[PDB]
């Protein structure tokens, strides 16, 4: 058999971690064991796993289906408790309230080299930084100062964060990690207080250990191309922008070409900036704001929302574009900091 | 041609009341527009499906006299955008617009006012309130039927039902009403009524009914709708006249305790004296139970509804007591409060 006896709101918080990531694989496992229960679920190429502990009167296993749980749970009674007991049928008890639940038993349920620490906040700020730009490639760069980067492109666009290395680094190689774990990941970051993150990797898998929860994740079959490759080297033009005051601005004039004409057209000029974004079949709109600019007068394009998304995770009062031409691809860092730099492909306007 | 300059979010409130009736799949391009007539201190923002037509008036200072039409949802989501109480100046040169607010500035594609398309025997008056609470009793019940019943004191009645499944709401009728007749609203109508009503203060509302048409102004807006063509059948048929056995139950333990075994779309009611076991089963997902207190002195039944159609039910009534009247598990039941002015009628499922 098996016994447990949870607080609802305690077990409700515990159960949204699982929640968002074949009959067994749409099920999660419950694990009651040392004073500590253990929910666990995976799609073969993720798993979680939040233990909290508790009180536990028989120990045992089994394996419920997740989201149905999830949705008892919430209808529960806050603060009420609920009591889980077997006699591949399980039982939850909440008052009156006595649900019955088709299971199925643990059995049919599925070496790191490195390891070291590292604050979840400053963990998710570099994936904001590249999740909006296959996988974001996890290495170390050695530059006299260690630097932990991550990395991710489309073809010639690109995202690159760099960020001082911890200790336990030295000698972790160069791997791909997924985008479905990265988003998984950030959801993770997002539901929990400030803390700190054990990050080991293996031959094939990297987890994530937040106290409570762990997360784990296969990883790419493959190799990156030198991503040095796309990124400019001697863009000469430089201009620069109040970051809030270009983000809003941006956002106004994209709104006449809700669909396809997602371009906006930037007139540059010596200390000016003229926005422009038309529309045949809606018509044209205009905005002009201060800029930092001495070089050759240059129009160019750019799509409206990769702006904003740059933008977005800029975190200067100020946004720095290194320019060339109307073709060739611009270079967007702040104004302070060379932890993160972008690349962006211009369009047509 | 014109000109004026209005504050942004209570331009954008106005906005968004008649924003929902525009046909953004409306193929005809002045249907996909807005008219915009200013005139005598006030803007008056006009749109229609050719079904339904939302106006809405608020007193603006104003520059230029004059009128346009202009795409709706490109405009609402522009001036959504658009910092918060800025003021923003609108221009013309027809289908020409000028916008400007501070360093931004739009031109749109419009269509001129004379493209845009264009007697009521009966008027009345009821409370935003009361007639908002008249609807949320039937919305979850093609239309519903609008008459009196003359029961000595003057019933101004709602009905919609689904065969035998029915909703039926009563109100004291107020000053004008007689001599209106009996029409049928499209629920299309009504969904957009209610909301009308939610982002608006309590006040009264002018209920103005013509030959073909019924139009209500409700201060700002004014809302009008064409009637369906048809017949609504005597539902007096389909109420249950003789139901013996009656059930009394807390309204929020029932909704919560349905709410909660409904997780697992019929539940069966096992009701004996003073008891009432509640029963979901699910042959690929299990069972649940549950028990609540009942006022049950009848023969015991067993008797099955639909989750859905009981939360709303009891979502609508307001007092403790939830009343129930029944047969057998095969004959529909009758709902009531204890303020019997609403009664609802739920056909019974198998279980």
Redesign the interface.
Known sequence: HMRITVDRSQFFKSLGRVHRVVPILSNVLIDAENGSVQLKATDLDLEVTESFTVNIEKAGAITV?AY?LY??V????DGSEIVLSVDS?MSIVSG???????CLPKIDFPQFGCRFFLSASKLKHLLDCTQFANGIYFHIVHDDVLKLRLVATDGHRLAQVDMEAPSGVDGMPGVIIPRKAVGELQKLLSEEIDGDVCIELSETKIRFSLGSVVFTSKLVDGTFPDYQRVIPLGNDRKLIVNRQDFS??V???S??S?DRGRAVKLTIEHGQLKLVVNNP?????????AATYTSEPLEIGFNSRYLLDIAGQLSSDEMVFMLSDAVAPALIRDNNNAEVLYVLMPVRV
Do not use: M, W, Y
């Not at 919430?74 to 009674?77: A, D, E, F, Q, S």
């Not at 079949?281 to 704001?289: K, Y």
């Open positions: 289906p149905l949705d008892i919430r209808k529960l009674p049928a009156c309230t006595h649900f019955q639940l088709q809003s601005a956002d106004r004039v709104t006449i809700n079949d809606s018509g044209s709109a205009e905005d002009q704001l």
